[PDB]
Symmetry: D2
Subunit: 347 residues, 4 copies
Amino acid sequence: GLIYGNYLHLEKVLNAQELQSETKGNKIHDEHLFIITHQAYELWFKQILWELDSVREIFQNGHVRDERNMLKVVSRMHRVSVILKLLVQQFSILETMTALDFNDFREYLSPASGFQSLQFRLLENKIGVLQNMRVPYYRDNFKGEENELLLKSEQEKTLLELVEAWLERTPGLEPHGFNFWGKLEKNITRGLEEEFIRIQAKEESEEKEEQVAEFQKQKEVLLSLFDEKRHEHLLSKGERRLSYRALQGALMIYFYREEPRFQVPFQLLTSLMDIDSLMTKWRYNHVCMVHRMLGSKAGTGGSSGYHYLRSTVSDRYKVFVDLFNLSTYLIPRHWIPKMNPTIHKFL
Amino acid sequence: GLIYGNYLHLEKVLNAQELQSETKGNKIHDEHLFIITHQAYELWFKQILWELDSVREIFQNGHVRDERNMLKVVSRMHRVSVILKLLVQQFSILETMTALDFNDFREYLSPASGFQSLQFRLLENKIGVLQNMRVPYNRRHYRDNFKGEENELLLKSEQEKTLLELVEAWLERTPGLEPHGFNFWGKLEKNITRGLEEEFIRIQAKEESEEKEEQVAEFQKQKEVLLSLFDEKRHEHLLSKGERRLSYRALQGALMIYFYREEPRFQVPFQLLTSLMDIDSLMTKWRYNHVCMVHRMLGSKAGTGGSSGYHYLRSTVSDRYKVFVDLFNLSTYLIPRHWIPKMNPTIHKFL
Amino acid sequence: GLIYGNYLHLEKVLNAQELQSETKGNKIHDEHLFIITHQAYELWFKQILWELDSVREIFQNGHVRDERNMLKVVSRMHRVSVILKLLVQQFSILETMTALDFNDFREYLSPASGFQSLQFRLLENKIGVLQNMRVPYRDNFKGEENELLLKSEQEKTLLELVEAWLERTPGLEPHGFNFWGKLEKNITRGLEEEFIRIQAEKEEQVAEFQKQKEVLLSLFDEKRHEHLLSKGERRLSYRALQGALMIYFYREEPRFQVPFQLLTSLMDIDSLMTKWRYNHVCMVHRMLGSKAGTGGSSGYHYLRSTVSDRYKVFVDLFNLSTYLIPRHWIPKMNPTIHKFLEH
Amino acid sequence: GLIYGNYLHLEKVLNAQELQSETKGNKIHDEHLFIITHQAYELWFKQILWELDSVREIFQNGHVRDERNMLKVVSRMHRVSVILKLLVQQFSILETMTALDFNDFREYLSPASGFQSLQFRLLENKIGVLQNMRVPYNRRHYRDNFKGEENELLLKSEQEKTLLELVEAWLERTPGLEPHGFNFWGKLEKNITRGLEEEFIRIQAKEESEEKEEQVAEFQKQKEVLLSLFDEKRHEHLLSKGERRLSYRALQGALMIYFYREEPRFQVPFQLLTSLMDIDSLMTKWRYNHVCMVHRMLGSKAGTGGSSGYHYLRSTVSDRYKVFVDLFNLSTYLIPRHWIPKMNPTIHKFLEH
Ligand code: HEM
Ligand code: HEM
Ligand code: HEM
Ligand code: HEM
Ligand SMILES: N[C@@H](Cc1c[nH]c2ccccc12)C(=O)O
Ligand SMILES: N[C@@H](Cc1c[nH]c2ccccc12)C(=O)O
Ligand SMILES: N[C@@H](Cc1c[nH]c2ccccc12)C(=O)O
Ligand SMILES: N[C@@H](Cc1c[nH]c2ccccc12)C(=O)O
Ligand SMILES: N[C@@H](Cc1c[nH]c2ccccc12)C(=O)O
Ligand SMILES: N[C@@H](Cc1c[nH]c2ccccc12)C(=O)O
Ligand SMILES: N[C@@H](Cc1c[nH]c2ccccc12)C(=O)O
Ligand SMILES: N[C@@H](Cc1c[nH]c2ccccc12)C(=O)O
């Protein structure tokens, strides 16, 4: 019964290539590569959305609470990063088209543009790209059911929100349990006092002063971790994304990552940072290619082109910026609150 | 006005995903990845066919005679190797599927298989894989997967001039082969004979030892192989055994381009021969990346397509599928620079 | 204060390039690429040995028994896979050397060869390639190096250390969860239940079933395992094989999640090691055609023979995919066993 | 008899791994990966310099004039691209180190940093990064990080002819620019003037609508930009600001090679100009891969080298470091195929091998 071509619906996939250059009586060879490249990107965007929606659902329905499901969650998020690595490398194919050959069919593209990629916007919204923090110069380019899908993607819970809620339930944050945050503040305070005492002991000098100057900056940054009102301020400015408690959960997972219950959660947090890193690399690879194709010419979508695309390579689009910035507060191993054999048994 | 999704016919591309697991009311999540991965490979096969047919046409219609067209030829053949590099890497995506999760939807695939990939067979044929070259199982079982217009397209792909045949005819016309002109082959036989005579004298001069006795036997091996190049009867014998594919005169053209590659008229031609070897290497790396994956997916299990599975696929990782094997094997006959026939001012100007 | 160049000992690393063509009064430009490529490969071989020895020691010193060390074990084995991926890709650099430019300095290399790569042999040995299964190596070494290589053959391999760990896999104990007994029962019921279905298209369905029955029930023949094991065609003990299959089937159970990742990584390393070998083959074919190597091998022909399951140490982890069954056949796990496989 | 290990001097290469964490009696496992990764980069930087210096010399000694050398020049410049491609991908290895594990040995590194990579600075200089276009970090020149011979070597790298200067000189001699010959620049201005006039007449002829106002606006913009290409004084201004790098005549040569790339004598030259943009693109991609990894390693911590760290590195991902920016920006002035000045059989014959 089942045949390869029918199974893969190749009657659709391999009959979707219509050169506008040809339609308008001036067939240009490289337009075919241009079409295929975009169609391959859109297939992989569909796969990323399939994986991403399935992970969002595992969080939203509480399946993530059952830790049996963590291999599936980390495997699928790792799989998204493996797909994004290919999409970054895939620009190398379209770069075998010269700007001069591109120029021969560019006129037939106006006013279509990548601003009309539904799936790219769905992908951005569902990971959790800030709606206000987008570069000043998006949903205007969409109508009908597509506009509806995009609104759903903006209103439904993002991977960021769902990871946030899960980080807020991380074991060990309980003030009457392990009391991670209280102990951490106590240990950092005591650690810094002892570091100062031994800087003071040294003989007055340009070096000692440099050492005091650096200690004072590091002290201010480390203790700023414990300033909740500062966090709330930076939250409202969109410079941070995660709730204060979610930050505590993530830092708990970082410090105690070798504890069996935190091993795969540490892999997940690593994977989320990988996905942000590969999405900005996708953007910058797109940028470097567009510079060769357009120079300083305006895009068919109405943007300044090259200059606009450069502005999207920015932490404005880094959804898990907080997971990166937590590296600001790494401390000597021996300052990390100790685990009692009971804390160990629970993890 | 033109819209992105309309331009790219995404109403077809993004409505072509039907999970057979779901159609039998037992939806398996990873079947979606399986479908997208094959669909992406088939889009790229279609692009390779588009590049490959355009280059076949440039050879067939004689446009290749105008050397203005050589940048276009080498760019498109290089583009094929860049696409094949991505397709080799693309297996890393499907390797994120465990054998256990694959096993949950495999039953819904039978009897469909990669043997029913029309485009993969069109690609093999159009580069110039011959029915004889295919491993016994593959040889006849390959055409028997296709009916109607699909079978018509495969017949055409075998009946029409292959890239091998078209490159061969072009290599036969390589400037410098002309016995009345630069007479490459005559001068090469003379210089290699003279070169071997000087080498035999150098070795014969050496103080007697074990190391001399070794060099003598090694020299005698190299002399046998190098002088065998000029035995056209031996060339024809190896053609019939399928050990060589190119005509004797095309082989001479290939060596001309290798030795004189820096001559301006042979610069892009040398890039093209490099690209043809690249495409053979990447086709066989594609085959071997597929083998390594299938081994983890099936172990010793037989394929849905009817083959032994892992064991069959290993047999396709063979030089019998290497269309431009002769371009690789010409490295057997590389000689010291100072043995290569000199070009005087007259022949340099012509190139 | 520490300085970058001093820290990295670049006084050594960047003063280690001597072109033999230039030493013999005939400097060939592309020999520099040739030297750097091999040196970069050897640095990464050293890094893989560093990771692989550290993981061997975690198994051998008992620390792997502490399941808090599994993240470290899988990260380091995954790191080996990421290094090998780069090393496969790294052939693309040396392939920018034409066979004709290589031919200009090849004469200065004899009789040196890759057969004299100490680290490559150490890597093969330490993963657990056995000397009797090698395609017809220590003859190429002397003194301290021949010594290090004998140690690499005599000391516990990653295959042996993983074998011993797989034998202790929870759920195998006959008095306990009794996985192997339960699995045989369920596959026996599974097959005779399908025969009943099939016997009630119809010709080929009877043939395919008897093929499947024969193979599946052959899994339970321990005598047959020991035969193929002694004949070098299998590598893991029968109990280790049961552990592996336990981890495959129950991989989602928290305590088996990172172990499954580890089994996936061991298969990735075999796959990438053979891909390294095959990329080396594809390049050497263009460089040499049918010429014999400076090492005294047939060259291209000998290298092809190393692209075989003779060199696939974890071949058993691949072949376990032969014996995969419908998931409803897998012995159900009660709340008693489920709680034992929680962290 | 030559031995593998002796040939590759592995007695040096594989005895250069000293963990500072171990030297201070606290050995950290991942410091070994850190050291090997930097050592591999430096081996490849040396190979890039070897290729780059060989190609600089082929231009400088005048051998580039004999067009039989063009396969060698393009092969070696493409080889630099292939190496840089691997170096971009190589960051994936060091990314298998967590920020937590890096934090366990970071203390033993200060005040060493990548600001002290002689070869990275040599590479930047020899391609043609402007010293006055470099981003500052401590109000002083990057070369303050170097002393003695290293400082001298970097000075020579700044002073000696860069790849940009050598390519520039060669572009100025591009056949077809000579006003008494093919007169490319004269014909191009004439053809663009005509092209724009015929384009205006076509817009003038449409019925008054938003579509016309769009086309009139879009047209007068394209008109301004294209005609600007012929303003030599505008080019000289932008050249002094460092917004352009190539002389006006070199720019003409590059555009000649773009438009007539298929002419046999311009085929390998067009490949070279493509390779030069690839190298700019792969160097900036190296910088951004470095940036993305460093964000996870340090967050907003200051660098051992005295920079702001992540924030400073983001500022080097900039057209300040794009040496062949003019080759990219020429795509601004691409025109319809039929506007390109026609080649008669005489110039066709002079641009054949
Ligand atoms: C010759 C190749 C390409 C050129 C010249 C190009 C040009 C542009 C330009 C100028 C923009 C900004 C909007 C505008 O004014 O049009 C843009 C945005 C975009 N392009 Fe491309 N593009 C190319 C290839 C691709 C490919 C292969 C993809 C694959 C999906 C893609 C996806 C996008 C997306 C998703 C956007 C929206 C990005 C954002 O707003 O952040 N582009 N492109
Ligand atoms: C789980 C993944 C895969 C498995 C288990 C698999 C298995 C097989 C098997 C067993 C065969 C031999 C014919 C048969 O008996 O069925 C085969 C052939 C083939 N497969 Fe795959 N395959 C996989 C993925 C892919 C992908 C992604 C492609 C992409 C196009 C592909 C393309 C082919 C082609 C073209 C053939 C025919 C090759 C030849 O005859 O030389 N396969 N595959
Ligand atoms: C032009 C490039 C190369 C050629 C022609 C070449 C050739 C050969 C040949 C002929 C052999 C078989 C032994 C012999 O007869 O000499 C061999 C083995 C080997 N080569 Fe290479 N090789 C090349 C590049 C490399 C590189 C870059 C590495 C990196 C370390 C390498 C590592 C090895 C190793 C480890 C072996 C032993 C493999 C085994 O016994 O399975 N080769 N090579
Ligand atoms: C954990 C990994 C790494 C970290 C955290 C790191 C951090 C930094 C930082 C902070 C700087 C700015 C100067 C400073 O204040 O120290 C820098 C510059 C640099 N790093 Fe790295 N780096 C890493 C890996 C590497 C590697 C593997 C290379 C390989 C050569 C490298 C090469 C450089 C170079 C050349 C610079 C100077 C770049 C410029 O000025 O534009 N780094 N790095
Ligand atoms: N699985 C539990 C506990 C939990 C929440 N966040 C975590 C992070 C790491 C480990 C466990 C947890 C839950 O989802 O509520
Ligand atoms: N926006 C591109 C054109 C383009 C790129 N990708 C596309 C996909 C569809 C339609 C148009 C495009 C330009 O300005 O040149
Ligand atoms: N272009 C000419 C001459 C030619 C044939 N083969 C070649 C190989 C290399 C260079 C030139 C040629 C032709 O097609 O007949
Ligand atoms: N032949 C494969 C199944 C398979 C792989 N790729 C496919 C694509 C379409 C249909 C079936 C397949 C097997 O034996 O398991
Ligand atoms: N950690 C225990 C139990 C164990 C052995 N092998 C395993 C495999 C998976 C999970 C647990 C185990 C041990 O080393 O003896
Ligand atoms: N064995 C290779 C030469 C070779 C490859 N890699 C080497 C490293 C060191 C010494 C020699 C080599 C040949 O036969 O051509
Ligand atoms: N080879 C000649 C002519 C030349 C200069 N630049 C070029 C660019 C492309 C083609 C030829 C040239 C020279 O060096 O003066
Ligand atoms: N500058 C880095 C440390 C570093 C990265 N690479 C190095 C090489 C040598 C010495 C130090 C380094 C930091 O701030 O953490």
